[PDB]
Design a binder for this molecule. Sequence first.
Ligand SMILES: [Cl-]
Ligand SMILES: [Cl-]
Length: 98
Amino acid sequence: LSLEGIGAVLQMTDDYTIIRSLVAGGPAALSKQLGEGDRIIGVGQEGEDVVDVVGWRLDDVVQLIKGPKGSKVKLLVLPEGKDAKSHVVTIVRDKIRL
Ligand SMILES: [Cl-]
Ligand SMILES: [Cl-]
């Protein structure tokens, strides 16, 4: 089994896409910039705007995150917490064995 993307396990709770876990050895795990509880509120492709994904269906969000090996994805991350502010994390996608 393989996947071309970042190696993040996502779950949807109350309109938010949230990191549940990271796939062992994947780009997300290797980055050290993502963790359980982080909310992904926007996704941008290279050179493009960061599209708001709050309230979307999870499969539609995943389709923006996955992509070709070597291409970059911008994730607008909102850490866990009532008054959290957001920041961007850039991950280089890879083909990962699950
Ligand atoms: Cl895939
Ligand atoms: Cl959903």
